[PDB]
Design a protein around this ligand. Sequence first.
Ligand SMILES: [Cl-]
Ligand SMILES: [Cl-]
Ligand SMILES: [Cl-]
Ligand SMILES: [Cl-]
Ligand SMILES: [Cl-]
Ligand SMILES: [Cl-]
Ligand SMILES: [Fe+3]
Ligand SMILES: [Fe+3]
Ligand SMILES: [Fe+3]
Ligand SMILES: [Fe+3]
Ligand SMILES: [Fe+3]
Ligand SMILES: [Fe+3]
Ligand SMILES: [Fe+3]
Ligand SMILES: [Fe+3]
Ligand SMILES: [Fe+3]
Ligand SMILES: [Fe+3]
Ligand SMILES: [Fe+3]
Ligand SMILES: [Fe+3]
Ligand SMILES: [Fe+3]
Ligand SMILES: [Fe+3]
Ligand SMILES: [Fe+3]
Ligand SMILES: [Fe+3]
Ligand SMILES: [Fe+3]
Ligand SMILES: [Fe+3]
Ligand SMILES: [Fe+3]
Ligand SMILES: [Fe+3]
Ligand SMILES: [Fe+3]
Ligand SMILES: [Fe+3]
Ligand SMILES: [Fe+3]
Ligand SMILES: [Fe+3]
Ligand SMILES: [Fe+3]
Ligand SMILES: [Fe+3]
Ligand SMILES: [Fe+3]
Ligand SMILES: [Fe+3]
Ligand SMILES: [Fe+3]
Ligand SMILES: [Fe+3]
Ligand SMILES: [Mg+2]
Ligand SMILES: [Mg+2]
Ligand SMILES: [Mg+2]
Ligand SMILES: [Mg+2]
Ligand SMILES: [Mg+2]
Ligand SMILES: [Mg+2]
Ligand SMILES: [Mg+2]
Ligand SMILES: [Mg+2]
Ligand SMILES: [Mg+2]
Ligand SMILES: [Mg+2]
Ligand SMILES: [Mg+2]
Ligand SMILES: [Mg+2]
Ligand SMILES: [Mg+2]
Ligand SMILES: [Mg+2]
Ligand SMILES: [Mg+2]
Ligand SMILES: [Mg+2]
Ligand SMILES: [Mg+2]
Ligand SMILES: [Mg+2]
Ligand SMILES: [Mg+2]
Ligand SMILES: [Mg+2]
Ligand SMILES: [Mg+2]
Ligand SMILES: [Mg+2]
Ligand SMILES: [Mg+2]
Ligand SMILES: [Mg+2]
Ligand SMILES: [Mg+2]
Ligand SMILES: [Mg+2]
Ligand SMILES: [Mg+2]
Ligand SMILES: [Mg+2]
Lengths: 172, 172, 172, 172, 172, 172
Amino acid sequence: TSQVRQNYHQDSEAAINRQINLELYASYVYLSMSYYFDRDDVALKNFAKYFLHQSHEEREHAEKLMKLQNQRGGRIFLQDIQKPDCDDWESGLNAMECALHLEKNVNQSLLELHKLATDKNDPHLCDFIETHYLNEQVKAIKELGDHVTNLRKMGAPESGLAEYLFDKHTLG
Amino acid sequence: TSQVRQNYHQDSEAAINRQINLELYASYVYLSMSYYFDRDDVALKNFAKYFLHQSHEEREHAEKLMKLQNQRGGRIFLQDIQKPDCDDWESGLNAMECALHLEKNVNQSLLELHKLATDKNDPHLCDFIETHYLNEQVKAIKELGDHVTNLRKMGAPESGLAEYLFDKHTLG
Amino acid sequence: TSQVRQNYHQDSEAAINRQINLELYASYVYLSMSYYFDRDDVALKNFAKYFLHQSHEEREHAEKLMKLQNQRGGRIFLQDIQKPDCDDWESGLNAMECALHLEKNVNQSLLELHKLATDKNDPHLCDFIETHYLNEQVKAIKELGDHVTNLRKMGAPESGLAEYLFDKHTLG
Amino acid sequence: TSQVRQNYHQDSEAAINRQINLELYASYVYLSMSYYFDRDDVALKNFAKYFLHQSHEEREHAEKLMKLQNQRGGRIFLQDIQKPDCDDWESGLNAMECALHLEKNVNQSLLELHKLATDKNDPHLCDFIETHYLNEQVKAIKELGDHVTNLRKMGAPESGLAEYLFDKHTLG
Amino acid sequence: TSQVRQNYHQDSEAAINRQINLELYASYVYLSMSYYFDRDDVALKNFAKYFLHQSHEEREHAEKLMKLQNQRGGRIFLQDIQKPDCDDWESGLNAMECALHLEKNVNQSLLELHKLATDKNDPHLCDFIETHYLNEQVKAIKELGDHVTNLRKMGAPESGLAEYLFDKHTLG
Amino acid sequence: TSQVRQNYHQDSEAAINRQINLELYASYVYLSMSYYFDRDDVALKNFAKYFLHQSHEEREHAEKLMKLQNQRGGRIFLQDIQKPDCDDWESGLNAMECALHLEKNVNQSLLELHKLATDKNDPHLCDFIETHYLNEQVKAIKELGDHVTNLRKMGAPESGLAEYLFDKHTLG
Ligand SMILES: [Cl-]
Ligand SMILES: [Cl-]
Ligand SMILES: [Cl-]
Ligand SMILES: [Cl-]
Ligand SMILES: [Cl-]
Ligand SMILES: [Cl-]
Ligand SMILES: [Fe+3]
Ligand SMILES: [Fe+3]
Ligand SMILES: [Fe+3]
Ligand SMILES: [Fe+3]
Ligand SMILES: [Fe+3]
Ligand SMILES: [Fe+3]
Ligand SMILES: [Fe+3]
Ligand SMILES: [Fe+3]
Ligand SMILES: [Fe+3]
Ligand SMILES: [Fe+3]
Ligand SMILES: [Fe+3]
Ligand SMILES: [Fe+3]
Ligand SMILES: [Fe+3]
Ligand SMILES: [Fe+3]
Ligand SMILES: [Fe+3]
Ligand SMILES: [Fe+3]
Ligand SMILES: [Fe+3]
Ligand SMILES: [Fe+3]
Ligand SMILES: [Fe+3]
Ligand SMILES: [Fe+3]
Ligand SMILES: [Fe+3]
Ligand SMILES: [Fe+3]
Ligand SMILES: [Fe+3]
Ligand SMILES: [Fe+3]
Ligand SMILES: [Fe+3]
Ligand SMILES: [Fe+3]
Ligand SMILES: [Fe+3]
Ligand SMILES: [Fe+3]
Ligand SMILES: [Fe+3]
Ligand SMILES: [Fe+3]
Ligand SMILES: [Mg+2]
Ligand SMILES: [Mg+2]
Ligand SMILES: [Mg+2]
Ligand SMILES: [Mg+2]
Ligand SMILES: [Mg+2]
Ligand SMILES: [Mg+2]
Ligand SMILES: [Mg+2]
Ligand SMILES: [Mg+2]
Ligand SMILES: [Mg+2]
Ligand SMILES: [Mg+2]
Ligand SMILES: [Mg+2]
Ligand SMILES: [Mg+2]
Ligand SMILES: [Mg+2]
Ligand SMILES: [Mg+2]
Ligand SMILES: [Mg+2]
Ligand SMILES: [Mg+2]
Ligand SMILES: [Mg+2]
Ligand SMILES: [Mg+2]
Ligand SMILES: [Mg+2]
Ligand SMILES: [Mg+2]
Ligand SMILES: [Mg+2]
Ligand SMILES: [Mg+2]
Ligand SMILES: [Mg+2]
Ligand SMILES: [Mg+2]
Ligand SMILES: [Mg+2]
Ligand SMILES: [Mg+2]
Ligand SMILES: [Mg+2]
Ligand SMILES: [Mg+2]
């Protein structure tokens, strides 16, 4: 047992390891999305940059959870990082819709994590999740919803012109 | 009676209190408009910023009238600030059309106020209204008419692309 | 239903709309207070500035709640902003006592909002209220209590000298 | 009763006074530790500096709780600050082990305080404890565990060379 | 026996440990005083700042004596730091009168310490006390007497106005 | 078929996708290593920083291969990123030995990739591998061998002192 461990339930430790994997998975999804828009037959450079930045942010999310695990005296256990569900993301709109669904799924996992931390009376872990994850998620979900809405109203995915102009004006 | 009061008719005092309420009402209309465009299913960020700035300007209008009331020795009497007529503003074009109608209504109130000040031979109040309100109104009405015209010619409200591009190029 | 909405109870949405109205009401109370001290027969310029700044802060409070409503996928619904209970605030001490009572009332509303968010297991909303409102309120209540105490010990409201000197040394 | 007091349970007030005493006690323990390493027969200058800084941080912890007590309208009640359990701390490793045990004890007190604030539905006090104390404690406990581990692996306490080199490279 | 010890009497060593405790006690008295003036029903912010600074100075006094003990090869022995005699300090004037009495008591202890160092022919300890403590005490006693005098002549403690104005002009 | 594709064999395209996975795997190994040294019972902060930087470099390696795939008109196909072979890396020396073995394995894959590009007469791909990977690998392998050698000669893994001092002087 770790000399630093205090009020840190084994179930919370396990849940944190599951969350680490999920954040790394989200990083992988956004990495895949990014280079889809770098294809010569897609060629939306600011979509590509946007998703690559999101990919890097998700890796930071994972790293901060790994730091937390050690801070509390838990032990990191890593799993395979599953490949993303799509190889082909079809359109800027469809990728944004997938990212929205991804972020809502990660949010649900974080909310279940917070419920567990609450049930185990772990206020430090509750505050950690609230402080570093829950509002980040709300902002990410809101931004992706905003993007989806604009692309739809602009005429995407049918209008390749719309995706092009969104790439320049919103993501550029 | 106030030691500063001079040539300030009771009717003018009352009219100034009515104008204070109207300016606060205009501030509220623009506040509502602003956050309509912040909705995830509308998502026109520069419409939102534009109307929020207009909201703040209207509050300044109200404050300067409250200052005038005290400068002249009248007594401020506040009324409820009525909620705006619309919860849903439908489109960027429709919001601009509503703001145009609002500004023309506030202008009419200011012109009636000026007629009263003229009838009561209050040149200080006439100059105050002319100096700080009447040309501000003309410029605001002209700008909103310009915006309405551009949105119409661009294809709004049917073209969500038009509202998007107007948001970036004129309001951005 | 909003594409961004997740774990956001209809009751919380309604409570947030009620809180928006209350913050706008507080802004109106402080606006009224401010210009009372700008009257030529009151003439406490730093009381006036202090309350005007508080008025502007309350509008910011309202705006941040409107932003939150949209972030979470709720829909803003505005109500009339009621006029303040007093036209005449009588003295610097009495205005500070009224502001203290106002802030304690707004605090109670925020604490009921937090209880609801807790009952609905909304940790994001709990953190939002804690982060942006609850300590702001505690600090505001403490500052107003401090001011009330000083004015009382100085001899207010009987001593117009006390209110004058407090205006210069504490609010100036 | 205090004019500022709102939703602040008498039990919480008492618990905050107990925590104030404990933080002052921790300040005293670290003060004692510091000057032990300033002895001519111990002479580890960076151990001494490290613990003196920790001592000053604990006094700041106490002061912020005294500020909180007044912010919420409770009344500070001070008790004797007990002398530390050890006059002689024996070795750099043993002092770090004692500081680790101290911080875990203070953490437990803070977690009991948070449970009480939760039971009394005091979200402001919960947020205060989370924001200013609980992660500070986790970081302090982790750092002391790190230090203990390094000193042990280096060969302390038997190796006076290890304590000397740790003083220069980690604490210097 | 310490390798550095020279001409340092066991009685002086013990007296220095007693003085360390007394300086820490004075630090505690001023800490208590400080937060009394931070109460919402007292609310003299510059009294609070003044006494908090005095508290920090007393801790520095204690630390320099702990340094001296080690410099001379004595061994620090700590005792409980007794809580201050008053929880309620009643008025700015009464707190200043108590601080004056405190400083005169600490001065008497220092003068007895100096007599002992003289009797034991310890010129280094005599010079240390003279250099770092005796004139600091005289200046502190003179300043507190000055403050008491001004508060009395101003009309304190009856005049809450006097304490308020002293807070701004002398302590501000 | 891609409009940009020229002299790019399907076998090379597949090999590049295999290399992408391997570089992401190496990133994961170094991520795991990094946080092993962040454990409170290991606590070698510069080992942790060193491996985290290596992790980030490997992700850059992967990204540049994804860019190459698109530049040449191939299509990225991602696979699961396998978890690292070790959860526990035991010692600084053992982690360096594992990283050395990892880099030699990645080098072998790159050399097989280069042989394939040579056999398919793809000089652009040969130059890409030589320019951006092969000397990076040689330098990485040499540096890790240097580190292993120093740790062994210093007395690792038995000497926890050696690993501590290596952490400060070579990795610090
Ligand atoms: Cl970054
Ligand atoms: Cl402005
Ligand atoms: Cl502001
Ligand atoms: Cl500090
Ligand atoms: Cl200092
Ligand atoms: Cl880089
Ligand atoms: Fe970022
Ligand atoms: Fe994430
Ligand atoms: Fe998808
Ligand atoms: Fe789903
Ligand atoms: Fe995310
Ligand atoms: Fe403007
Ligand atoms: Fe206006
Ligand atoms: Fe309208
Ligand atoms: Fe009309
Ligand atoms: Fe207007
Ligand atoms: Fe402010
Ligand atoms: Fe507010
Ligand atoms: Fe009132
Ligand atoms: Fe009431
Ligand atoms: Fe407020
Ligand atoms: Fe610090
Ligand atoms: Fe502490
Ligand atoms: Fe101990
Ligand atoms: Fe214990
Ligand atoms: Fe501590
Ligand atoms: Fe000083
Ligand atoms: Fe002293
Ligand atoms: Fe006393
Ligand atoms: Fe006495
Ligand atoms: Fe003193
Ligand atoms: Fe590098
Ligand atoms: Fe590589
Ligand atoms: Fe290995
Ligand atoms: Fe092998
Ligand atoms: Fe490598
Ligand atoms: Mg992002
Ligand atoms: Mg375990
Ligand atoms: Mg699979
Ligand atoms: Mg909570
Ligand atoms: Mg936050
Ligand atoms: Mg304008
Ligand atoms: Mg009248
Ligand atoms: Mg109505
Ligand atoms: Mg003009
Ligand atoms: Mg304020
Ligand atoms: Mg609804
Ligand atoms: Mg009414
Ligand atoms: Mg929180
Ligand atoms: Mg906060
Ligand atoms: Mg510290
Ligand atoms: Mg009580
Ligand atoms: Mg005892
Ligand atoms: Mg925090
Ligand atoms: Mg002093
Ligand atoms: Mg002895
Ligand atoms: Mg006692
Ligand atoms: Mg002499
Ligand atoms: Mg001198
Ligand atoms: Mg490298
Ligand atoms: Mg193919
Ligand atoms: Mg496996
Ligand atoms: Mg070449
Ligand atoms: Mg080269």
